[PDB]
Design a protein around this motif. Structure first.
Motif, PDB file in Angstrom:
ATOM      1  N   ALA A 165      46.657  30.900 -19.380  1.00  0.00           N
ATOM      2  CA  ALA A 165      47.825  31.163 -18.551  1.00  0.00           C
ATOM      3  C   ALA A 165      47.452  31.157 -17.076  1.00  0.00           C
ATOM      4  N   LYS A 166      48.297  30.525 -16.271  1.00  0.00           N
ATOM      5  CA  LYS A 166      48.105  30.510 -14.832  1.00  0.00           C
ATOM      6  C   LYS A 166      48.550  31.847 -14.254  1.00  0.00           C
ATOM      7  N   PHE A 167      47.796  32.346 -13.285  1.00  0.00           N
ATOM      8  CA  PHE A 167      48.157  33.590 -12.617  1.00  0.00           C
ATOM      9  C   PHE A 167      47.764  33.540 -11.148  1.00  0.00           C
ATOM     10  N   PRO A 168      48.601  34.127 -10.283  1.00  0.00           N
ATOM     11  CA  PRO A 168      48.347  34.123  -8.840  1.00  0.00           C
ATOM     12  C   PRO A 168      47.056  34.851  -8.505  1.00  0.00           C
ATOM     13  N   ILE A 169      45.995  34.074  -8.322  1.00  0.00           N
ATOM     14  CA  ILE A 169      44.647  34.594  -8.131  1.00  0.00           C
ATOM     15  C   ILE A 169      44.537  35.691  -7.071  1.00  0.00           C
ATOM     16  N   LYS A 170      45.226  35.522  -5.948  1.00  0.00           N
ATOM     17  CA  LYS A 170      45.122  36.485  -4.856  1.00  0.00           C
ATOM     18  C   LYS A 170      45.843  37.804  -5.147  1.00  0.00           C
ATOM     19  N   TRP A 171      46.767  37.789  -6.100  1.00  0.00           N
ATOM     20  CA  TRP A 171      47.491  39.001  -6.476  1.00  0.00           C
ATOM     21  C   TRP A 171      46.897  39.627  -7.726  1.00  0.00           C
ATOM     22  N   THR A 172      46.041  38.864  -8.389  1.00  0.00           N
ATOM     23  CA  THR A 172      45.550  39.217  -9.708  1.00  0.00           C
ATOM     24  C   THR A 172      44.288  40.072  -9.649  1.00  0.00           C
ATOM     25  N   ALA A 173      44.325  41.213 -10.329  1.00  0.00           N
ATOM     26  CA  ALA A 173      43.182  42.116 -10.402  1.00  0.00           C
ATOM     27  C   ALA A 173      41.980  41.394 -11.011  1.00  0.00           C
ATOM     28  N   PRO A 174      40.757  41.801 -10.635  1.00  0.00           N
ATOM     29  CA  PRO A 174      39.568  41.105 -11.141  1.00  0.00           C
ATOM     30  C   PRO A 174      39.400  41.173 -12.656  1.00  0.00           C
TER      31      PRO A 174
END
Ligand SMILES: Cc1nc(Nc2ncc(C(=O)Nc3c(C)cccc3Cl)s2)cc(N2CCN(CCO)CC2)n1
Length: 269
Positions: A165-174
């Motif tokens: 699944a694609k997820f907004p990397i900059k908003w996404t927790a590590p």
């Protein structure tokens, strides 16, 4: 077969498309402008569309976009909600008069959002894409989180997103980047980033930084710098949200209480 939320599709007239698929329409009975989400009759997203409708039935909070009705008997399937006048918070912030939308207003918006998120925390929900784009604005700086990104935690505290699944990397927790695992804590991280968006009046997070490196920077304790004119307390909350360990991030209850007091204090001044 009987649902109170089910309304006749007759009572809705469409006015204008807004994106996607979302329309500005009119509930004629109440002369009320409403927002209507829909889908193509050829889609595999029917199941999730209906799941989210169901979820939104359970949701009731001032700072969560209020469900009004649905049309789930035959295509096209409608989800009807209240209409947020000004659209998303990102574009709002970017286009806003900053003399009007000033510091105390930013504090107010953060407080509202954290109220919604505390509510979700309590109700064992998580928001899969918490960002300024998925917050909508109404009159008097009213902010509501978009409830289509909601997932209910049936067991435990961790939602595993579908594989690949694609997820907004900059908003996404590590931990979400590394393991596709979303807790309410992951949402706390995301809320940190959203705080950044608010403070910068809608700047892109980690600006200029190549996406590929982002995770690796966070692992080595890199965090976004305090935005110009952002109060140190607020920035401290942002850093608290960006704790490496999920367990060390504050709860949305703590966060909301913090913003509540901060807002009252700014209101005194
Ligand atoms: C894309 C868009 N949305 C707007 N308002 C909305 N309110 C509620 C919406 C909504 O999606 N609810 C919802 C949710 C949250 C989940 C499931 C199902 C649903 Cl139905 S969308 C306003 C708007 N603009 C008007 C202001 N502009 C300047 C021109 O005047 C341009 C942009 N643009």
């Amino acid at each position: 077969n009987y649902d109170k939320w089910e309304m006749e599709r007759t009572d809705i007239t469409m006015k204008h498309k807004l994106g996607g698929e979302v329309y500005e329409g009119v509930w004629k009975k109440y002369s009320l402008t409403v927002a209507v989400k829909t889908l193509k009759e050829d889609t595999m997203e029917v199941e999730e569309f209906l799941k989210e409708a169901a979820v939104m039935k359970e949701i009731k909070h001032p700072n969560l976009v209020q469900l009004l009705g649905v049309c789930t008997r035959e295509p096209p399937f409608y989800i009807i909600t209240e209409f947020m006048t000004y659209g998303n918070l990102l574009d709002y912030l970017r286009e806003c008069n900053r003399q009007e939308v000033n510091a105390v207003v930013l504090l107010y918006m953060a407080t509202q959002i954290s109220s919604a998120m505390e509510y979700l925390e309590k109700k064992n929900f998580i928001h899969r894409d918490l960002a300024a784009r998925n917050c909508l604005v109404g009159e008097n700086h009213l902010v509501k989180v978009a409830d289509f990104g909601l997932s209910r935690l049936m067991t435990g505290d961790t939602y595993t997103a579908h594989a690949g699944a694609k997820f907004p990397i900059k908003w996404t927790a590590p931990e979400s980047l590394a393991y596709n695992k979303f807790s309410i804590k992951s949402d706390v991280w995301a809320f940190g980033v959203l705080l950044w968006e608010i403070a910068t009046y809608g700047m892109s997070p980690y600006p200029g930084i190549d996406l590929s490196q982002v995770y690796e920077l966070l692992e080595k304790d890199y965090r976004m710098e305090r935005p110009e004119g952002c109060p140190e307390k607020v920035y401290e909350l942002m850093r608290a949200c960006w704790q490496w360990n999920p367990s060390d991030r504050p709860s949305f209850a703590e966060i909301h209480q913090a913003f509540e007091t901060m807002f009252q204090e700014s209101s005194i001044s």
